[PDB]
UniProtKB/Swiss-Prot annotation:
Gene: PB2
Subcellular location field: Virion; Host nucleus; Host mitochondrion
Name under which the protein is recorded: Polymerase basic protein 2
Species name: Influenza A virus (strain A/Victoria/3/1975 H3N2)
Family: Belongs to the influenza viruses PB2 family.
Function in brief: Plays an essential role in transcription initiation and cap-stealing mechanism, in which cellular capped pre-mRNAs are used to generate primers for viral transcription. Recognizes and binds the 7-methylguanosine-containing cap of the target pre-RNA which is subsequently cleaved after 10-13 nucleotides by the viral protein PA. Plays a role in the initiation of the viral genome replication and modulates the activity of the ribonucleoprotein (RNP) complex.
Self-association and partners: Influenza RNA polymerase is composed of three subunits: PB1, PB2 and PA. Interacts (via N-terminus) with PB1 (via C-terminus). Interacts with nucleoprotein NP (via N-terminus). Interacts (via N-terminus) with host MAVS (via N-terminus); this interaction inhibits host innate immune response.
Domain of life: Viruses
Classification lineage: Viruses, Riboviria, Orthornavirae, Negarnaviricota, Polyploviricotina
Coiled-coil intervals: none
Leader sequence residues: none
Amino acid sequence: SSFSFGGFTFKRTSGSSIKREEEVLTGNLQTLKIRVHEGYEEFTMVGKRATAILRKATRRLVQLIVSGKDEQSIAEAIIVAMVFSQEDCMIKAVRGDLNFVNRANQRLNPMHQLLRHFQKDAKVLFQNWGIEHIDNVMGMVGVLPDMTPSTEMSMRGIRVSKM
Ligand SMILES: CN1CN([C@@H]2O[C@H](COP(=O)(O)OP(=O)(O)OP(=O)(O)O)[C@@H](O)[C@H]2O)c2nc(N)[nH]c(=O)c21
Ligand SMILES: O=C1c2ccc(S(=O)(=O)O)cc2C(=O)c2ccc(S(=O)(=O)O)cc21
Ligand SMILES: O=C1c2ccc(S(=O)(=O)O)cc2C(=O)c2ccc(S(=O)(=O)O)cc21
């Protein structure tokens, strides 16, 4: 399967899923209804400024390896992937209310609301995702919550690759 989300063409390379409508609670205890894809899947994300390779289990990002033009372009893809993954820590990183009433937001489903929320500011999302020690595996660097490259540590599951 092939589809678009957040400016990225996703192509499924492995795995399969069944979709199911589900409720989640934000960090502000707001209920959002999202369509959850159940099953382990692997995708290539093709964007105009970044490309990535995404592994996900149900509502869990397992791994993201991102290549791109620069910090912003690569963060853009990291944010898209984190939202797409539908992980609870991404949803718990929403600390205030999401506005479904105002006219400019009527086009947006909860998934696109979340995306927009993290595009405006990814700080809380990145801080609360979690961190891990990494290996010196080559071409690949870790990236810290402030998007600084690291050879020791990285946001959980996330690697930045050289072009
Ligand atoms: C989390 N997602 C989302 N997604 C696909 O990404 C596209 C983006 O749409 P979406 O806004 O998440 O949901 P969608 O089903 O289209 O609309 P809605 O739920 O508002 O009725 C859709 O084609 C959707 O099927 C996915 N596709 C696969 N294969 N696996 C997944 O985990 C996911
Ligand atoms: O808070 C929401 C809301 C929450 C979740 C979804 S859903 O995720 O599309 O099911 C959708 C919505 C809404 O569409 C909506 C419309 C009107 C109000 S109200 O004016 O605060 O009563 C709240 C909301
Ligand atoms: O094997 C790779 C490698 C393979 C594929 C890509 S890709 O272009 O992103 O697919 C990228 C890469 C790399 O960026 C890279 C960097 C450094 C080494 S090293 O000389 O063994 O240190 C190997 C590699």
